[PDB]
């Protein structure tokens, strides 16, 4: 259902459901959002901003789909920056930002995902795994842990999100993948993004 | 959860992960007890620091883009403070 919680706008990354990510939190309003969440159920809205240059983005300059996450672990560094390890849990639609000026706050809806199980979803998963195996030869910065674990992901939507996190693509492409709720469409996009030389197939 | 120990969590990011953050006029004054520019007290300038993953400041650059470029030019992997 619908809930209000504090927001942490991300400058220049997208956190998918099931990803565990260290982050540094240094803007005044972001820090305050975090202190808030840590006195409570430790849960925050991660949502990406449209332009990484903007230091103080407004609601219209932040995307409208984000990720509900839990703060796993926290360390205030001597200079005041807060080092935090966060875990994405689920896609979240942003209904609107509240009136709060101490920090960003928002009401968020749950999302439903078209999932399952024609010959399509099936062939796409296997194809995306196979393609991923090739892709990481061309992108040597994918950690070896992910090369071992990603071929084992059984749930298509999770598979697509894990590969998405590891692609060397612009922010806008990552945010687009977060917004594709149809799993078959998402796997199709991750496949296309992994194409090294634009398929003759889309001219 | 709490997946790491405090040292492991403080270390986390070594050796290459650095973050880049604004320097406020307050830090500028601490670093320079014999005097700063009036420009350092203005919103018209925002200096950036590049910091190791455990908080230790590595460098001071004129702006965010220079901080990001300086870090990449020295084989570090810069990230934002959000």
From Swiss-Prot, chain A:
Signal peptide: none annotated. The chain holds residues 3 to 205 of 799 of the full protein. Homohexamer. Organized in a ring with a central cavity. Belongs to the peptidase S16 family. It comes from Caulobacter vibrioides (strain ATCC 19089 / CIP 103742 / CB 15). Induction: By heat shock. ATP-dependent serine protease that mediates the selective degradation of mutant and abnormal proteins as well as certain short-lived regulatory proteins. Required for cellular homeostasis and for survival from DNA damage and developmental changes induced by stress. Degrades polypeptides processively to yield small peptide fragments that are 5 to 10 amino acids long. Binds to DNA in a double-stranded, site-specific manner. CcrM is an important target of the Lon protease pathway in C.crescentus. This is Lon protease. It is found in: Cytoplasm. Residues 5-198 form the Lon N-terminal domain.
